[PDB]
């Protein structure tokens, strides 16, 4: 009983994953890039029409597994370029020209565990030496900075940032991906929520990137094609400046590969919801950020290198 406009279960979105790929087989492809810490697979879907030397965008969604919006985007992500494929002009140029790498859900055990123990949890569910404390955080598991001021030593901490870079499954299968496609990887894209933020590096350090200018005016831009259809107002600029000291970061590990057009979005809403945003509000919150996302997809396209 899949339905775009209700949050789904992982056994819902598994089944969902297998059932979209036998619906539309010229569009997408289904592959599983490695397991996590309880045996479950990691599923990556391959959007667009198959062809040579074509560049790639990557998308993830649910790295925190209390953010239940970012799961739900990945999912409409899917449901428009299936249905407006052949009757819109912009997205059948998109899925011709590039690949969509999306990656519904990245923490699939932490989402297990919001909806069978507790709703509000945010890290992986992995055994920690020496405590009780499960749990590391996949956004500060990454080799960009690690384990520096704004991440935690403690494994009983919500910013923990593990015994080593890369020491969880779910964030080594997610890396290892990027290292296996960096020569067609153009754009790296990391849904989360909430705050209505669009962040770009660096957050491991207080430092501007190469190319600040244009990852600035692209943001600026991003934001007005959001705000055109409900008035939702989002802010931007890179992440030590505009929110905290991150490290060991996915957006920030991706440039310092060689992706130059790196994001971060947290979606709806400010507050009065939070993590736990009505059902209601998903088709609003999932049409939105679809204008602010082919906006930097038709970006990338006429700035390929
Ligand atoms: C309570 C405290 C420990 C903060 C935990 N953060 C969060 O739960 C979320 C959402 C939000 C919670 C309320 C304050 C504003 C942020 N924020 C979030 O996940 N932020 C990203 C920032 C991404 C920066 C790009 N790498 C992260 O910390 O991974
Ligand atoms: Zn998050
Ligand atoms: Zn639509
Ligand atoms: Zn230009």
Known sequence: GHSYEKYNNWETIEAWTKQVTSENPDLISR?????????????????????PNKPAIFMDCGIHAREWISHAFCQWFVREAVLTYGYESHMTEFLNKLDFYVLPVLNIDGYIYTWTKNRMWRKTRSTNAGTTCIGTDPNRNFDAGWCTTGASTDPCDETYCGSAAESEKETKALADFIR?????????????????????????????????????????????????????????????????????????????????????????????????????????????????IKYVTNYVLGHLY
């Open 31 to 51: 592959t599983a890039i490695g397991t996590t810490f309880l045996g479950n697979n990691i599923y990556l879907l391959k959007v667009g029409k198959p062809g």
């Open 180 to 292: 296996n496609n960096l020569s067609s990887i153009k754009a790296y894209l990391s849904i989360h929520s909430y705050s209505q933020h669009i962040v770009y590096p660096y957050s491991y350090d207080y430092k501007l990137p190469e190319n600040n200018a244009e990852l600035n005016n692209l943001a600026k831009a991003a934001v007005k094609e959001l705000a055109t259809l409900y008035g939702t107002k989002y802010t931007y600029g890179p992440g030590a400046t505009t929110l905290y000291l991150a490290p060991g970061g996915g957006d920030d590990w991706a440039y310092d590969q060689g992706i130059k057009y790196s994001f971060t979005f947290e979606l709806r809403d400010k507050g009065r919801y939070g993590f736990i945003l009505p059902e209601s509000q998903i088709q609003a919150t999932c049409e939105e950020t679809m204008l602010a």
